[PDB]
Amino acid sequence: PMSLIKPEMKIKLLMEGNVNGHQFVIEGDGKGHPFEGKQSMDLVVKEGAPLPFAYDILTTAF
């Protein structure tokens, strides 16, 4: 394939999870520069707030 991905892209995300029995839902809205290898996102806990565990374990999954 000859990629048509643009230098600027947007990102929409929905995460449903459960850690040690704690259910939660997190929504994400972000954007990034595919060819620069950089991206950023605003994450909001919609269900299960406040999370009773380290948020860091979730970050690479967004």
Binding site: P1, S3, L4, I5, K6, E8, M9, K10, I11, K12, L13, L14, M15, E16, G17, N18, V19, N20, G28, G30, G32, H33, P34, F35, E36, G37, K38, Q39, S40, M41, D42, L43, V44, V45, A49, P50, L51, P52, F53, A54, Y55, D56, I57, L58, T59, T60, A61, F62
Partner: protein
């Protein structure tokens, strides 16, 4: 979403080739104290927006461990080793969370990537440096600003 990784011309970019159909990935996170997580993401594209359907499950974390006690500070930068396992692009990583008290907590990552696009050119063994960071967050992390920088390379 490995689409957000700077790939040099000499290494086939499995991810940017995976569109418009998209791709998905599965990941196991094995923590040194027994915690085990499984994360999956189905990535699609509509217009100029990537959509992510993510599922995250974690079990067996010690109740007084750094994860359940929220004692982590950040993931250290890392280098993912990319290769094919039984024809499937796989990324193995020696990950580590920095904890309060200036100590580390290790986690082994294995991610498998599966494109839905036909004719994708597969890459050979290579690497992808990563650096993920929470730029800012509110007290309970109900609101988090996340950022990642990734660069693929051939080592040396």
């Amino acid at each position: 979403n490995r689409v957000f990784a700077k790939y040099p011309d000499h290494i086939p970019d499995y991810f940017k080739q995976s569109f418009p159909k998209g791709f998905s990935w599965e990941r196991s996170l094995m923590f040194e104290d027994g915690g085990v997580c499984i994360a999956t993401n189905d990535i699609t594209l509509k217009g100029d927006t990537f959509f992510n359907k993510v599922r995250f499950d974690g079990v067996n974390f010690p109740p007084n461990g750094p994860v359940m006690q929220k004692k982590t500070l950040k993931w250290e930068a890392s280098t993912e080793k990319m290769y094919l396992r039984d024809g499937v692009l796989t990324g193995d990583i020696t990950m580590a969370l920095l904890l309060k008290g200036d100590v580390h907590y290790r986690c082994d990552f294995r991610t498998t990537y599966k494109s839905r696009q036909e004719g994708v050119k597969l890459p050979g063994y290579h690497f992808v440096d990563h650096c993920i960071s929470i730029l800012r967050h509110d007290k309970d992390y109900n609101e988090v600003k996340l950022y990642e920088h990734a660069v693929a390379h051939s080592g040396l």
